[PDB]
RNA sequence: AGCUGUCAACCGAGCUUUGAUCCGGGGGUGUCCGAAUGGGGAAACCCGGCAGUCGUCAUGGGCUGUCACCCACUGCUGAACACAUAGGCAGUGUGGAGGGAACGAGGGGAAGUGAAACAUCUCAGUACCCUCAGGAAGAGAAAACAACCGUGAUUCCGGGAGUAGUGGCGAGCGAAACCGGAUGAGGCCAAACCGCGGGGUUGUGGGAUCUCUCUUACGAGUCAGAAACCGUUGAUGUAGGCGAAGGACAUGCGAAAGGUCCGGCGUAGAGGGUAAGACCCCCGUAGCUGAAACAUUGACGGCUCGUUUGAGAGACACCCAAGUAGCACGGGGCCCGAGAAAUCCCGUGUGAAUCUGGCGGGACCACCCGCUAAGCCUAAAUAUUCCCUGGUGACCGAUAGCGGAUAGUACCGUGAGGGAAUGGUGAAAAGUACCGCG
């Protein structure tokens, strides 16, 4: 869970060659970053999309 | 009840004392076996209930 | 309960038809009344313990008011009427008079 | 004084106890009362002193469990009670009768 | 007509538009009001 | 004109025409536990702080208020460190916490079973679980359909149709266009530009900015397009009132509502009781009638709000929702099981344009047609009954009907949990005085 944009993990199926379905999970690429919110130093879990966009 | 409403605050506080004291004596008489009119216990309790009601009514200004 | 306490009534359907009598006590919740003279039962009571004869209640719909009209007596049903101050007064219907 | 901050000692003293043991205790100037279960020995002492204007020496309290009783339908339990035995100073007495 | 006749024990009342087979067969006689008769036939 | 609930009789003692009991509306009290919330705890127990107050020589002890955490805001202080923040202190909040029969939206998500085996598939997005609600929810004002003709927000019902399709093309699954119906409604912002306010709201494209031409009181409201309250009054609700008309004779056994004869009311012959089948004995029904009080909901007045220059022509290419659309990979859902796979949703990388912009019309290209995504709000048709009022049954009638003619009780289990059996004297107790054996 990105603390900025609310991007959460997605759920789906992992499919084999035999086409057997099992449950897996796409977790977003969330990196722990030290940031300054309101002049105060704080550590956040942020997704690289927010980093790339400059939201932090 | 109407007859009570004409009493002052102190008079109402008083009347509560005698009401409480009277019930006290009736309870003792009943326990010791000398009570004759069982209905009095109920009667005095209702008077006791009235006096609080009027005292509270004055406090809240109803 | 139209049948008040202390009225003159007539048993219209029972072991003792005809007999008039006063209304001793009325039970307006179970719809029964006591008419002195009718259904006089003999209770076997023990200890002065012995046979005692007192009247048992009869159903209210088995009696009916007696109003006096032109000499002799006549049984009547009862209606109501306001006078001027919204006061219902038992009004006889056989005669139209005020009971 | 108001109608919420009003307290009368006669509420603590529910009633006296009449019994052979209580009668035997009268001769020793120990009076047994049934008191409000929420009262403590200190309240009992103050209540008796104010109600009867007597000098209380000691107060003992007995907590008695209600007696379970059988009925047609099943089992009921009488009320629990708290009994206080008040020992008075020499020469002081209470007329409970 | 409705209020006058509805209380009679033996009389069953109907609108012209809701005349129905069951009521006709049960009833010994059928009585129309002239307004009803023309409304039904039309 | 009686009354003191019921099992449930009984005694005793009382209240009551100076209006009781009973019924409806409002108000006061409301111990302790429980979100439990001063601290603690084996729920209904234990121990306190602070302020006030009663009491005593005084401690001890009573009584009232108040004190959890998180969040919102106002102020004081500001660490290591210097700004400074973190943090700490103070002040307030009708802010949150938990409960609830069914119904709803969004997520997670089985297996028994079927396939006469079984793994793709089915069961099934069911059971169950998680977050959030409301009286309904969700959806909803076209980046939509259609096919060159045209319809014009959404929802729900009957078709289209078990059809086109889909499928170890197995077991199975299964639309849409369009047609007939229920209800009917449209509003507002972001952006550019100007100083949180103005501005503007678009698909025939519109808006900004600049130049030119002409011109220069009124409406809407308790709602989705803002939001309350004060009063006057209308209706409905929560107690009620009135409300027609039958007698005689005999029988019966014990009681007439049944028999015989004569009658009556009927805007009332629904139903229930009354000592056996009652329109006229009672309760009622048809039909009218009623509210100090408070609730629901209208109308009006006060009240509140919105608007008070506008239109056309020409310029200009300034704006029209970005880590988004698209594309690559891995997945989900759609009739469609990844296939040539469109549209829709998710994660990872890469990654535009602004009207010559962009999207769809089932790979893809061109033309043509429709429409403006990356913002929001929205009643009505629709689902449900824990509960309340009034009714119905070719539904049950005590091994039936709810498990329960009250019981989630007795009993069983450590516990989640399982869980019964027992209705009927008579019209009225008149429930057998008295005598005798014991």
Q: Which residues, 6+ apart, have CB-to-CB distance to B59 below 8 Å?
A: D2, D3
Count of CA atoms in the C-beta half-sphere (13 A) of D66: 11
Q: Rounded to whole angstroms, how far apart are CA atoms B28 and B38?
A: 12
Which token pair is D24? 């035997």
Strand F proximity: list residues 35-54 of C with CB under 7 Å: 39, 41-47, 49-51
Length reported for chain D = 97
Residues from chain B contacting residue D2 (CB–CB below 8 Å): 55, 59
Instruction: Give nearest nucleotide to A51 (CA–C1').
Output: F323
CB neighbours (10 Å) of residue D48? Answer: 24
- D interface test, pick of B27, B29, B33, B41 with most D CB neighbours within 10 Å: B27
Q: Does B1 touch chain D (CB under 8 A)?
A: no
The phi and psi torsions of D81 (rounded to 5 degrees) equal -140, 155
Determined by which method?
cryo-EM
Residues from chain D contacting residue B22 (CB–CB below 8 Å): none
Task: Decide: helix, strand or coil at residue E5.
Answer: helix
Task: Decide: helix, strand or coil at residue B47.
Answer: helix
Q: How far is the CA of A10 from the C1' of F144 (A)?
A: 30
Q: Rounded to whole angstroms, how far apart are CA atoms A14 and B44?
A: 83
Chain B residue at shortest CA distance from D13: B24
User: Which position has the token pair 């035997």?
Assistant: D24
First to last CA, chain B: 15
User: Which position has the token pair 């012995």?
Assistant: C50
Q: How far is the CA of C81 from the C1' of F188 (A)?
A: 67
Interaxial angle between packed helices B9-32 and B39-60, expressed in degrees from 0 to 180 and rounded to the nearest 10? 160
Residue D30: in which H helix or E strand, if any?
A: strand D30-35
Q: Does D9 touch chain B (CB under 8 A)?
A: no
CB neighbours (10 Å) of residue B48? Answer: 16
C78: which strand partners?
C92
Kindly tell me the burial class for residue B49, based on how many C-beta atoms sit within 10 Å of its own C-beta (0-12, 13-18, 19 or more).
exposed
Residues from chain D contacting residue B59 (CB–CB below 8 Å): 2-3
Q: Rounded to whole angstroms, how far apart are CA atoms A46 and A6?
A: 10
Q: Are D85 and D31 in contact (CB under 8 A)?
A: yes
| Helix spans in D1-97 (H) | 20-26, 41-52
Resolution (angstroms) stands at 3.1
Closest CA to C29 of C54, C60, C7, C8: C60
CB neighbours (10 Å) of residue B15? Answer: 18
A42 touches strand F (CB under 7 A): no
Q: Rounded to whole angstroms, how far apart are CA atoms C96 and C5?
A: 22
């Amino acid at each position: 869970n990105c603390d900025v944009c609310g991007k959460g993990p997605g759920f789906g199926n992992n499919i084999s060659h035999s086409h057997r379905r099992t449950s897996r999970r796409w977790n977003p690429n969330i990196q722990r970053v030290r940031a300054v919110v309101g002049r105060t130093p704080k550590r956040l879990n942020v997704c690289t999309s927010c980093i790339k966009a400059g939201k932090v | 009840a109407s007859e009570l409403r004409e009493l002052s605050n102190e008079e109402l506080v008083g009347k509560l004392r005698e009401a409480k004291e009277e019930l006290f004596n009736l309870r003792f008489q009943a326990a010791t076996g000398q009570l004759e009119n069982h209905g009095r216990l109920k009667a005095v309790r209702k008077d006791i209930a009235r006096i609080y009601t009027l005292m509270r009514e004055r406090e809240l200004g109803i | 309960m139209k049948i008040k306490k202390g009225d003159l009534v007539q048993v219209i359907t029972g072991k003792d038809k005809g007999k008039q009598g006063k209304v001793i006590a009325a039970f307006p919740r179970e719809d029964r009344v006591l008419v002195e003279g009718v259904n006089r039962v003999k209770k076997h009571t023990k200890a002065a313990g012995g046979i005692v004869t007192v009247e048992a209640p009869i159903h209210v719909s088995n009696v009916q008011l007696v109003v006096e009209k032109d000499g002799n007596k006549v049984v009547t049903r009862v209606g109501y009427r306001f006078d001027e101050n919204g006061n219902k007064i038992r009004v006889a219907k056989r005669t139209g008079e005020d009971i | 004084v108001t109608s919420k901050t009003f307290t009368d000692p006669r509420d603590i003293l529910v009633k006296p106890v009449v019994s052979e043991k209580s009668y035997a205790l009268l001769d020793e100037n120990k009076y047994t009362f049934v008191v409000d279960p929420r009262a403590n020995k200190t309240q009992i002492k103050q209540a008796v002193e104010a109600v009867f204007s007597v000098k209380v020496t000691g107060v003992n309290t007995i907590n008695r469990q209600g007696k379970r009783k059988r009925t047609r339908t099943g089992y009921g339990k009488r009320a629990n009670t708290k009994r206080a035995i008040v020992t008075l100073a020499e020469g002081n007495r209470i007329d409970i009768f | 007509a409705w209020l006058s006749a509805r209380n009679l024990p033996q009389v069953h009342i109907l609108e012209p538009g809701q005349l129905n087979t069951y009521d006709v067969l049960v009833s010994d006689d059928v009585v129309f009001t002239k307004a009803a008769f023309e409304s039904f036939v039309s």
